[PDB]
Amino acid sequence: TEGRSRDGGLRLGEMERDCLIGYGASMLLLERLMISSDAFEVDVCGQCGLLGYSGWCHYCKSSCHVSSLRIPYACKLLFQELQSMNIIPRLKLSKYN
Amino acid sequence: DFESEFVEVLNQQCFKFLQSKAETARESKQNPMIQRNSSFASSHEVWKYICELGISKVELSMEDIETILNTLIYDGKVEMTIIAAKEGTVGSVDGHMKLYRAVNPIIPPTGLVRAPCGLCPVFDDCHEGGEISPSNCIYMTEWLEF
Amino acid sequence: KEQFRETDVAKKISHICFGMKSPEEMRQQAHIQVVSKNLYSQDNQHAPLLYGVLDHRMGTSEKDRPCETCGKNLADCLGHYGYIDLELPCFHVGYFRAVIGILQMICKTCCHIMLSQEEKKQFLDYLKRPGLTYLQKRGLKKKISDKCRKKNICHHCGAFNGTVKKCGLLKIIHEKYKTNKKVVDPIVSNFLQSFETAIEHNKEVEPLLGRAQENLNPLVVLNLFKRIPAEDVPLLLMNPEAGKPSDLILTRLLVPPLCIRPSVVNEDDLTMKLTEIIFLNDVIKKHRISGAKTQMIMEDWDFLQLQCALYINSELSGIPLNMAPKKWTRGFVQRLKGKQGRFRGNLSGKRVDFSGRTVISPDPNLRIDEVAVPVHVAKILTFPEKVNKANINFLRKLVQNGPEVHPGANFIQQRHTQMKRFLKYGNREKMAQELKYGDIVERHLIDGDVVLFNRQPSLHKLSIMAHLARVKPHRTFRFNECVCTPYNADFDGDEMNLHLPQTEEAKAEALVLMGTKANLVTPRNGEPLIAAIQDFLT
Amino acid sequence: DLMTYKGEVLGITRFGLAKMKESVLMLASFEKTADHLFDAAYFGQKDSVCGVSECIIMGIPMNIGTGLFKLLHKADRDPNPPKRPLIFDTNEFHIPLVT
Amino acid sequence: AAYTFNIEAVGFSKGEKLPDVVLKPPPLFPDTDYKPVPLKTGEGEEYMLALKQELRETMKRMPYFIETPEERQDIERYSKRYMKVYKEEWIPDWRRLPREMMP
Amino acid sequence: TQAEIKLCSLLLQEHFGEIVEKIGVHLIRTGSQPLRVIAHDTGTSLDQVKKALCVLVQHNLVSYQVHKRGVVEYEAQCSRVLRMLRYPRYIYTTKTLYSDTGELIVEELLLNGKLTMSAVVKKVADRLTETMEDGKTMDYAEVSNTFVRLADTHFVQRCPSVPTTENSDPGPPPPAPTLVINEKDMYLVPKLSLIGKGKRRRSSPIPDDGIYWQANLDRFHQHFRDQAIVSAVANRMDQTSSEIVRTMLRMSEITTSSSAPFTQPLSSNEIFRSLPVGYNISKQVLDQYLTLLADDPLEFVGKSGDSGGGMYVINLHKALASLATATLESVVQERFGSRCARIFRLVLQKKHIEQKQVEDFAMIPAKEAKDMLYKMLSENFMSLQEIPKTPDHAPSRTFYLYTVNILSAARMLLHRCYKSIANLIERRQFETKENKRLLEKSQRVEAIIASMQATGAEEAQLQEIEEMITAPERQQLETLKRNVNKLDASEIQVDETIFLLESYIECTMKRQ
Amino acid sequence: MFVLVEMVDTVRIPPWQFERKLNDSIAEELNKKLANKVVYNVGLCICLFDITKLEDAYVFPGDGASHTKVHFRCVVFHPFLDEILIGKIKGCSPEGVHVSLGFFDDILIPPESLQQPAKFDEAEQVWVWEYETEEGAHDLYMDTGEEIRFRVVDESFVDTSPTGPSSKEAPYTLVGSISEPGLGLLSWW
DNA sequence: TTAAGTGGAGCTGGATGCTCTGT
DNA sequence: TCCAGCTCCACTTAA
RNA sequence: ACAGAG
Numbered sequence A: 001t002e003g004r005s006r007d008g009g010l011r012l013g014e015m016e017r018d019c020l021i022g023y024g025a026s027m028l029l030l031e032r033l034m035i036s037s038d039a040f041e042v043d044v045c046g047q048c049g050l051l052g053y054s055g056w057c058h059y060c061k062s063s064c065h066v067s068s069l070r071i072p073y074a075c076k077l078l079f080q081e082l083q084s085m086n087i088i089p090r091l092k093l094s095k096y097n
Numbered sequence B: 001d002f003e004s005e006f007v008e009v010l011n012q013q014c015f016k017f018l019q020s021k022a023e024t025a026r027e028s029k030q031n032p033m034i035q036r037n038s039s040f041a042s043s044h045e046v047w048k049y050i051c052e053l054g055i056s057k058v059e060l061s062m063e064d065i066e067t068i069l070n071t072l073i074y075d076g077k078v079e080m081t082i083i084a085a086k087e088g089t090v091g092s093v094d095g096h097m098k099l100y101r102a103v104n105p106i107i108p109p110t111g112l113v114r115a116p117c118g119l120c121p122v123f124d125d126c127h128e129g130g131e132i133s134p135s136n137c138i139y140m141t142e143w144l145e146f
Numbered sequence C: 001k002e003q004f005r006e007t008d009v010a011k012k013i014s015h016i017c018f019g020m021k022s023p024e025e026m027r028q029q030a031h032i033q034v035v036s037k038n039l040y041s042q043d044n045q046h047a048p049l050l051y052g053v054l055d056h057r058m059g060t061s062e063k064d065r066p067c068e069t070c071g072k073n074l075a076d077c078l079g080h081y082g083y084i085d086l087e088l089p090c091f092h093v094g095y096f097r098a099v100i101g102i103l104q105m106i107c108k109t110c111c112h113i114m115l116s117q118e119e120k121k122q123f124l125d126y127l128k129r130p131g132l133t134y135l136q137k138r139g140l141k142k143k144i145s146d147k148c149r150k151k152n153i154c155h156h157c158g159a160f161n162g163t164v165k166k167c168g169l170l171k172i173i174h175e176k177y178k179t180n181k182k183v184v185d186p187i188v189s190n191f192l193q194s195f196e197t198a199i200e201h202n203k204e205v206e207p208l209l210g211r212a213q214e215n216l217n218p219l220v221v222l223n224l225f226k227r228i229p230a231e232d233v234p235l236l237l238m239n240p241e242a243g244k245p246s247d248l249i250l251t252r253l254l255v256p257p258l259c260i261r262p263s264v265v266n267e268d269d270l271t272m273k274l275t276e277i278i279f280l281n282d283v284i285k286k287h288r289i290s291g292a293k294t295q296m297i298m299e300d301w302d303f304l305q306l307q308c309a310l311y312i313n314s315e316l317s318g319i320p321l322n323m324a325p326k327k328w329t330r331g332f333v334q335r336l337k338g339k340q341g342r343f344r345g346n347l348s349g350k351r352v353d354f355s356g357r358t359v360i361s362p363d364p365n366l367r368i369d370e371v372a373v374p375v376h377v378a379k380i381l382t383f384p385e386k387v388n389k390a391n392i393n394f395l396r397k398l399v400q401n402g403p404e405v406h407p408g409a410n411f412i413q414q415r416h417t418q419m420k421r422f423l424k425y426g427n428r429e430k431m432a433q434e435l436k437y438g439d440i441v442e443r444h445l446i447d448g449d450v451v452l453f454n455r456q457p458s459l460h461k462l463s464i465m466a467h468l469a470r471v472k473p474h475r476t477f478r479f480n481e482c483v484c485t486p487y488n489a490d491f492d493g494d495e496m497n498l499h500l501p502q503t504e505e506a507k508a509e510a511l512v513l514m515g516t517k518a519n520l521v522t523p524r525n526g527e528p529l530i531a532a533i534q535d536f537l538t
Numbered sequence D: 001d002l003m004t005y006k007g008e009v010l011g012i013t014r015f016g017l018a019k020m021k022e023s024v025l026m027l028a029s030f031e032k033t034a035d036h037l038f039d040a041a042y043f044g045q046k047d048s049v050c051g052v053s054e055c056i057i058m059g060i061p062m063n064i065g066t067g068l069f070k071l072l073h074k075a076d077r078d079p080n081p082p083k084r085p086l087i088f089d090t091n092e093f094h095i096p097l098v099t
Numbered sequence E: 001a002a003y004t005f006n007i008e009a010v011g012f013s014k015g016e017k018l019p020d021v022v023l024k025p026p027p028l029f030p031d032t033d034y035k036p037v038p039l040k041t042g043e044g045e046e047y048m049l050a051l052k053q054e055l056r057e058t059m060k061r062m063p064y065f066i067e068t069p070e071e072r073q074d075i076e077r078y079s080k081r082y083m084k085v086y087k088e089e090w091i092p093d094w095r096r097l098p099r100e101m102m103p
Numbered sequence F: 001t002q003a004e005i006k007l008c009s010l011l012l013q014e015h016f017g018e019i020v021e022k023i024g025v026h027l028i029r030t031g032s033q034p035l036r037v038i039a040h041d042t043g044t045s046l047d048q049v050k051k052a053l054c055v056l057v058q059h060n061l062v063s064y065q066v067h068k069r070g071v072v073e074y075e076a077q078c079s080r081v082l083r084m085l086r087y088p089r090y091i092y093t094t095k096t097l098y099s100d101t102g103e104l105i106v107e108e109l110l111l112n113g114k115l116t117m118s119a120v121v122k123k124v125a126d127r128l129t130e131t132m133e134d135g136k137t138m139d140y141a142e143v144s145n146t147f148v149r150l151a152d153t154h155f156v157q158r159c160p161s162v163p164t165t166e167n168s169d170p171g172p173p174p175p176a177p178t179l180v181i182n183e184k185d186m187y188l189v190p191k192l193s194l195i196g197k198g199k200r201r202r203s204s205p206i207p208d209d210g211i212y213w214q215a216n217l218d219r220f221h222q223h224f225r226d227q228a229i230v231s232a233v234a235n236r237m238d239q240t241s242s243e244i245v246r247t248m249l250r251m252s253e254i255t256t257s258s259s260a261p262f263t264q265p266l267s268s269n270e271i272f273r274s275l276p277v278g279y280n281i282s283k284q285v286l287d288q289y290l291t292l293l294a295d296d297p298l299e300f301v302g303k304s305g306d307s308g309g310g311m312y313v314i315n316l317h318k319a320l321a322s323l324a325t326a327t328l329e330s331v332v333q334e335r336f337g338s339r340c341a342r343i344f345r346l347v348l349q350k351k352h353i354e355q356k357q358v359e360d361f362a363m364i365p366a367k368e369a370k371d372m373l374y375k376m377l378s379e380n381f382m383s384l385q386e387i388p389k390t391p392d393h394a395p396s397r398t399f400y401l402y403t404v405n406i407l408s409a410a411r412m413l414l415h416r417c418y419k420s421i422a423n424l425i426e427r428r429q430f431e432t433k434e435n436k437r438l439l440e441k442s443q444r445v446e447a448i449i450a451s452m453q454a455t456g457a458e459e460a461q462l463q464e465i466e467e468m469i470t471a472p473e474r475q476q477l478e479t480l481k482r483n484v485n486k487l488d489a490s491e492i493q494v495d496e497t498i499f500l501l502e503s504y505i506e507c508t509m510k511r512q
Numbered sequence G: 001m002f003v004l005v006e007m008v009d010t011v012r013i014p015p016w017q018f019e020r021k022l023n024d025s026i027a028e029e030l031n032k033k034l035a036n037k038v039v040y041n042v043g044l045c046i047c048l049f050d051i052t053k054l055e056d057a058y059v060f061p062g063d064g065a066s067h068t069k070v071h072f073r074c075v076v077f078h079p080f081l082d083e084i085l086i087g088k089i090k091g092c093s094p095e096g097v098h099v100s101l102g103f104f105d106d107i108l109i110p111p112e113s114l115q116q117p118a119k120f121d122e123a124e125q126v127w128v129w130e131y132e133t134e135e136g137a138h139d140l141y142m143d144t145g146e147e148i149r150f151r152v153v154d155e156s157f158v159d160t161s162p163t164g165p166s167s168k169e170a171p172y173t174l175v176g177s178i179s180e181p182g183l184g185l186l187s188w189w
Numbered sequence H: 001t002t003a004a005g006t007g008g009a010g011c012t013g014g015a016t017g018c019t020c021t022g023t
Numbered sequence I: 001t002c003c004a005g006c007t008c009c010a011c012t013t014a015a
Numbered sequence J: 001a002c003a004g005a006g
């Protein structure tokens, strides 16, 4: 949350992101802006690219292409504000090698 | 409107007076140049029979039926030709005279209305894999039984 | 007996491919149909209507009443969609500048594209090359519309194709029957004389028929776009595997789940706009049955184009005065743009935890790579120390001290479990004798931890460095005054931030890359910044 | 050299950056956030996740800095090991029957 | 409750008779007042219906109907010569066809 | 044209297969392609592209032209594949003007695409050995006698033939040899002295090399053009006024082109001669008809001349406009009612009209007509003009004029038909997919009857056919066949709705 | 009756197993995920036969474990069609003869493919066989499980996958026949 | 005489720093 | 409060 | 929405 009265916590701004890139710290930028805010997992269908639930892709009516992806939560918020806008963010996943 | 349930019987009344006159020309079978002229009815003559039947107390006036006779064109059932007023019992139009003959429709109805896809209100939403498919349709499966 | 199944299906993202859905793939994604306009029932149960917006078959937005589609709480469910049907088609407010761009390049009689044959052979071979970038796709539609708008007769049917331009808020005109001072053409003569019926009962038709053009509506451009040939769709620069030209006009509208719109904001701005769309689905439908005039149908249908446009983007330019909003509502666009949007407020920079902010004060008895963290902050900011062979006898004592004595632990966590036992309750000398190899002790911040150290206007990269914390009892952050030059701090009521990393990799990237002993020079020209300051030069 | 590598002097505006950078998220996380989204929806434009500002949004680690090389593990292992011999199905004992 | 837009701009100048709110959604198949025209019958219309079944039974058996190539058969045996689906092979006129298509 | 691409993937599926439609539909969908990028943009092997194009160039469904660097690019024809649905309508209409010999000549040309005159008279002699008995053989001579009469009435035309390589471009071989069509010998048959007898299927050096014959699918359309116009004249006046239109059009066969608003005008002095002798009609009664058909505001015919007595022409494009008018109004009456079709004919004649004049001119009240006005704009049958008062274009300061556009409603109504046929094919291929259990069960019990039918066939296999449990199952198989007879017959009858629409769209396109 | 099946995988080796050789630790982990399990199109996977190619062992960011790609051949029980085995009896039912094959238990010998003199039991679960001279209608397939001989004429796979959101039927079936001369108990021949 | 390619003028839509600390 | 694109309209050359 | 602080 926002402020001291709400037990808020501090903000990695738009400019302190620009300073961690200058050091080349990649995993520290990952730990500050993904893991210690809003780490989350999503059922991503690799076939069509949409988002499923509990292994059940209601689009394809099948359960053989769902998969789990490490994502921030404010991106999963973004990928469903945009499907309501009819701007469909179809993903395509591959193996993590 | 004048009345909805009053004009629905005059649509049934004028065409029977316009078809049987052509049938008396059709059963005449003398000369198709004259059989065509024996098919046209006068615009004043068609007024003289409908007022004689005595269906309603209100007057079926001449200025009213002249607008009622346009509806039989719009069902594709009669024509209308305007000729010059050379001779007639009245000649209600100055220098002109209107004629009426009943006709058949031009073609038999097309093959699209014989299909269940043609008359359906949810025609646009039907597709292969989803809910509304022809594989699980009520409109066909009712129509294919009888 | 039992069939194989892959246990942990982890995959990496490769490429994000935008697009759009057809209005019969929206039916395949959602679960219910939304027909009711009213949010809550008339009784005291605070339960929403069972076929409207805020239905709990579309995800949950509170812990109290769980969802209905998958029976889980707020902390588990991803959210599920619903759809609204429209009895009249409408434009989508984003695609409207590309609805005009297609009607400039295709005909409006045969729906084919307006190019000669040698011109069609050139671009369809230009789009075959590998490595085709997004710049080389945007520049090509500029060149094709330079060729299509110079031609006004079709090479396939032969109809006249005048220009296509905007004539108001979401209205498209088409100059098919423009007139000139020259000899009257046969195609402009026949249209301008077939007005004989309308002039008979209406006198004002005669002055106003000099401006009569083909006003295009969503009912026409839905019909025109279903007949575009799919050999000529890629010369509209649309990708045919991400959307159709029939999809740019919406006849069915998805609603977001309740994870997108909270229950107590009471209701969100995008909830209140979905009430006004469903209500104007039943006002327009009422005037179709009860026989209103066309000047009331085209009036109420102007609202449905508007109430879907402000639903998406609530800062339009050319709204008439009788239809402008009185109060300000957030559309989908205004919660994507700006400083408090997604891309500047919640994605590129976001509020973190394991942080601290306190007034600073000087101390030269520390080294140049140290920082004095107070005891009140060091008891709160913890680090997950994984138990292994080296630190087991150290972490047993740090568990046995507890959450109050300073070298202690606030939590404990077992090997394959995801819960945390708060270490104040229960006996701690039993939980210290039951530690296994692989449990996680969350010990207090102690002497030697790597912690970052930030001042809030961060100009260059030495405005954030990593120091080695050393706990001291007083209530400030404290560091040697040789480090007042990189941060530009001055100790006059000045506050600085703190960030404790939580992973070992984040420790090692903070200690080697971002150390104070490894950043003694600025990257600008190579001059030293951590050096002597006043009272160390005098 | 960043301003002049496409034969034209491009600015550091939102118009010079819209000719240098290709990623839709990098274009739309800076200025004119909505128009790039509808344009990438229209063109069907696929985007890569190779750049920096769209690795931070997607939560994958960036390619610059410490994310440019991969660490292997020096395991005591035998690649392409000695296999087990097939006894029954060899080539010299199973000439097929048909001509 | 008043909304963002003006209801008076929409209509409703009397102040009453708002349209009703739908509780249960409409079904997938709304019933129609009218039915399709029945088929055109006769001895001349029926023979076209008979030959159309005699084309699916004929054109599937033609050598143009290229059947999909089989694969991943298990092993060889002696019951293969009895089950070999025999079908003659047609050669085209290569004077018409391009050179680029010989088998 | 998303409906045409879905239908072409069905017509190539039942008639040609699964691994051949991937090559044909992809040329309708994408465009002109060399052979190597067809396999890359589909994913098939290079051998299957050699098999799937040689069948599609056999039946003339794909064409080709030479380009830069000698590459060979193909191009499928969308309208030519959609006419594979009218194959039973092409075999039946040659059974009228020609005998059962000529019925099987075109049926060999349509199923095989291209044949030689040496081969087509063989199979018609072969396949008619079953239709005769008692030693009577079908000879090669009279089949050719029907074949040369087919070329006289233009139902069979020569293919665009290969040129002579010894006269044009000798030397290295070109990849695509640039085939070309001649104007003289489209119907000039080669002479044949060869005769013979057909084989009865007992199961126990070429003169016309390069001269290939294919079916003229345009002439059957010109033959179906006449029967639509004549029957439209037939229903209005009389059978006697019907034959006069049939008299001119049979004379107007060989003298006008496929797209002409006006044919060559006929003089009545030779109309009386070519009129059949079994009609009790004088030359004066002949001049009675020809002046009253021009008086009809349908205007099937025109005068267009004065020399040589009575000079008379017949319209073609105005007649197809009247046919597309009766097509566009017979679909309103069956979907929205009879009273709704009263309004669509009103706005058709009174070209631009408002709400107040419709309820007056048709005697349909308020709140009964406004439902039937609004459901036609929603189904794209009627359009608005919206003449403004101001350039603000506000709905409170303008008029709304209802206006029927025929041509935009003629393409849309045709687009409804292409999806309508494909939905019929999907229903038939659904009930046959889910019931291959029952048809194999009807196959096996008849295989006991079929296999060992006469050779060593005892009578102890006739009563064991109905012994299987299929005997109460026969109620569903009769329900399956009565569906197919209503699906495939409705599948043919929509082509009548297509052809009246397809001829009206073809005559208004200039192709400039 | 055993065949080989070649697959690929990515094997996570946790860092508490680095003291042991990689090839001795890959083979244990693959048997913890494939043994006594029917991979869908290939049959019942008994165990690993050999590992044929072992690529490099990446360490991905965010983990200490090493992930390596493994090419390997697994011995799999999959008989070809009409292979004649020897099998035992567990019990009988009106649905058919339930034949055990050691590790595997779901074999169908249906009454539609039993021997011709006896086809329907006398409301006894145990199946019968009638011969005129000796043992008339009182022969029985004994529940003690003597060895029979049969012929697997039909095999069929079913996709046993979760349908619906996640918060026992056999995916490997087998249908045989006994009607041939020489198929049945070994005591008869 | 006019078709057409290119100048100049007005309209339009976008943007304008980072956080905590309280009412 | 400041600044690039988009569209309308006169202004010469050329046939 | 306003005031502060660096």
Ligand code: SF4
Pocket: B116, B117, B118, B120, B122, B123, B126, B132, B133, B134, B137, B139, B140, F423
């Ligand atoms: S739902 Fe079925 S019957 Fe109705 S239009 Fe679609 S396919 Fe035809």
Ligand SMILES: [Zn+2]
Pocket: A045, A047, A048, A049, A050, A057, A059, A060, A065
């Ligand atoms: Zn899916």
Ligand SMILES: [Zn+2]
Pocket: C058, C059, C060, C067, C068, C069, C070, C071, C072, C077, C078, C079, C080
């Ligand atoms: Zn849920």
Ligand SMILES: [Zn+2]
Pocket: C107, C108, C109, C110, C111, C112, C154, C156, C157, C158, C159
């Ligand atoms: Zn056109």
